[PDB]
Structure formats: C-alpha cells, structure tokens
Design an enzyme around this catalytic site. Sequence first.
Site, PDB file in Angstrom:
ATOM      1  N   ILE A  69      16.505  31.950-133.949  1.00 17.58           N
ATOM      2  CA  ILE A  69      17.961  31.961-134.073  1.00 17.58           C
ATOM      3  C   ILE A  69      18.593  30.608-133.787  1.00 17.58           C
ATOM      4  CG2 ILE A  69      20.096  32.943-133.208  1.00 17.58           C
ATOM      5  CD1 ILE A  69      18.399  34.812-134.897  1.00 17.58           C
ATOM      6  N   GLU A  80      18.431  12.805-110.254  1.00  7.65           N
ATOM      7  CA  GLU A  80      19.682  13.377-109.778  1.00  7.65           C
ATOM      8  C   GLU A  80      20.205  12.913-108.443  1.00  7.65           C
ATOM      9  OE1 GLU A  80      19.115  17.403-112.485  1.00  7.65           O
ATOM     10  OE2 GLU A  80      19.389  17.642-110.312  1.00  7.65           O
ATOM     11  N   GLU A 136      23.179  12.643-120.439  1.00  5.95           N
ATOM     12  CA  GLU A 136      24.477  12.913-121.022  1.00  5.95           C
ATOM     13  C   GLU A 136      24.495  14.429-120.907  1.00  5.95           C
ATOM     14  OE1 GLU A 136      23.117   9.766-122.315  1.00  5.95           O
ATOM     15  OE2 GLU A 136      24.856   9.407-121.011  1.00  5.95           O
ATOM     16  N   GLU A 177      24.971  16.049-117.934  1.00 10.18           N
ATOM     17  CA  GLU A 177      24.937  16.390-116.511  1.00 10.18           C
ATOM     18  C   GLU A 177      26.149  15.820-115.776  1.00 10.18           C
ATOM     19  OE1 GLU A 177      21.079  14.728-115.512  1.00 10.18           O
ATOM     20  OE2 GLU A 177      20.283  16.759-115.158  1.00 10.18           O
TER      21      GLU A 177
HETATM   22 MG   LIG Z   1      19.104  19.377-113.057  1.00  9.33          MG
HETATM   23 MG   LIG Z   2      18.367  16.665-114.371  1.00  7.41          MG
END
Ligand SMILES: [Mg+2]
Ligand SMILES: [Mg+2]
Lengths: 182, 182
Positions: free
Chosen positions: A12, A94, A137, A139
């Site tokens: 899908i 992060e 891009e 986050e």
């Molecule tokens: Mg993450």
């Molecule tokens: Mg990440």
Amino acid sequence: MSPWERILLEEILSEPVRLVKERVRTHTGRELTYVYRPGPVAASFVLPVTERGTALLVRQYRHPTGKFLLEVPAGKVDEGETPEAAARRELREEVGAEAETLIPLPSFHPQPSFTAVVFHPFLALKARVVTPPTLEEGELLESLELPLTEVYALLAKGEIQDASTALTLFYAEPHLKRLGLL
Amino acid sequence: MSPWERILLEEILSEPVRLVKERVRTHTGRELTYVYRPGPVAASFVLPVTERGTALLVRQYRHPTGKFLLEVPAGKVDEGETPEAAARRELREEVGAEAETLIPLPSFHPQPSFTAVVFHPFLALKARVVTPPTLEEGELLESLELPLTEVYALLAKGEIQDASTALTLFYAEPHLKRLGLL
Ligand SMILES: [Mg+2]
Ligand SMILES: [Mg+2]
Ligand SMILES: [Mg+2]
Ligand SMILES: [Mg+2]
C-alpha cells in the site's frame, strides 16, 4: 505453521513507511483483509545514564500525537546494523553522547496487532556528551539532563507517556539499583 | 501551537484501519510527507486478577509478528464508549469474565511516531469467569489462568513480549502488593 494462509499481499505504501494489505484465509476458513507494517524491522532505545546518576533524555515532537514527549534516545535499526550499534548511533545523533557499557534489556513489540517491529532497549553507562547533536530532517527535539530520582518520580506518578521509554525505565531500574546509581 | 503546518492531508486507507499521508511544512520551512494513523483513537487493556491471586490472560495470534503472544485482554474503545466500559466489554468478550473494581493505571502511547492511539490500562479485581468468550471474526486466542507469581516471574525474566501487557504489569505491581495479592 501460521494459522492464516496468504491469498494475496498488496503493498500500500513503501515510503516513508512500508505498509501492506494482506488478504488471508483465517482459522475459520473465511477471508479477511489485514493491514499492517511488515517485518522484519526494528528500532533500538537507549537510556543513557551519567556517572552522576542523571539521565540524558530528549523532549521530542511526535506529530501523530501533536505533543512533545519526554523519551530516551531511539531510532530505527538500519539495514545490516546490530541493535547495539543503532543504539550507540542514535545516542550520538540525538544527544551528541557516547557511553561505555550497554546492558541489553528485554525486547518487546510496541503494537503487535499492527506492526511487526521489535524494539530493543539498552541501559548505557557512563554516558557523556562529546559532540553536537546531528538531527535528521524531520526530527524536532531537544536534549536535556535529569536526575534519575526525578525521572523515576515521573515514572511512578504516571507522567511518562511514551510506552517504550516507560518500559525501558522499568527494565533498567533493577540494574540501576544494583549499580548504586539509583 | 503545532510546530508543523498542514499543506495537504490525504486518506490512504479507511478500513480496516484509517491511515493518512500528510504533506506538512516543518520547523525548517521545508516540506515533509508524514504517514500515520490519526487520532483521536484509543484502546483499553485490563489485567484481570482473581481473589486467588491468579490472572486471567490470553494467548493470542498477532499476525504481523507471526507469533501467539501472552497478553492481558484488550481492545479498541468504541465510538462514544468510555475506556473503562471498553475494558469491561473486552474482558467479557475475550475471557468471558466480569470483575468488581477497576483501578485505572497510567495511560500511554504505544508508538507515538506512527500512531495517535492512546492505550488505557486497568487493574481489575475479583475477576471471575461467568460466560463463554465471544470472539470477533479475526481474533484467534485462548484464555488461560496463571498464578501472579508466575506472571511476574516471566516479566522479570524478560519473557513478556507484548509491550502493553508488560507495562500494564509494571504499573499494576505496586497495587497488587498493596492489596496483598502479590
Ligand atoms: Mg529517534
Ligand atoms: Mg534519530
Ligand atoms: Mg483484543
Ligand atoms: Mg477483542
């Protein structure tokens, strides 16, 4: 020995996420259409704890919920990458951090009714920031530091809304107490 | 005050599950396509404990994982139904049971990156089987009874793969100890 037999499997969507619509013949002999995110796919979650008994967490925008949630760093395991490597990579991307030992915690399926994904939690020790974060891009998040006592107080008060983060904290707790960090 | 602005929202599927593909303008001013299961939607999870300190659980086939998982009874909250009512209804449908007090536990998002769904956990006391189960076409499961000590041993050993069931057990634990059931 699956209880359901595949009649037809239709894709899908393939990007940003793969989704399929499968027509199967069930245990009752009747047909059913089942829509899901197929496997094998995985993600790693990592609770980064410092030598000072604090945790490096992220406050991240999760668009489907419209909220910024307090979470441990985490991300999809890339093709051919081990879950521990994805954990270390997402920790560096992060939070801009590195850690020493990574203790693996019990893996779990966040929503087995819809997705095959397996989440692999880890407790990372001696976490330390060594570089600026490098976000993808898409986050939107900020890193922060909180005393473990406060993180666990929030957990007990029922304020940790992200299930994976909550579960990682629960599995990490006995290790943190054993190591004298909590 | 959402950080992302909607450009266009396309419905990719409506049944068996609603899925959307949204084009948005992000915090960077660039465009991004985000695919997710929109809200508001919810489900209730209920740990049914008997007066004998056992739990009424289900072993259910979860097709995306290809596995039968040990879970607490649970199900989608229907339109205009409260989460506690959905909990009692799924308890009756899946295990054929009724219970007295239902203690609400902290709600959580199983996978906020993909779905808006909120899961509402409950600890049900004095659970008892009073009728045969009534499963939906599509549900393949069997109910079983296990001593709480065994359920929590499995939890500690990391053998509870369904995240929601694991998290419900962790949140229920202090109440069970308080009530003298664990
Ligand atoms: Mg993450
Ligand atoms: Mg990440
Ligand atoms: Mg169910
Ligand atoms: Mg059901």
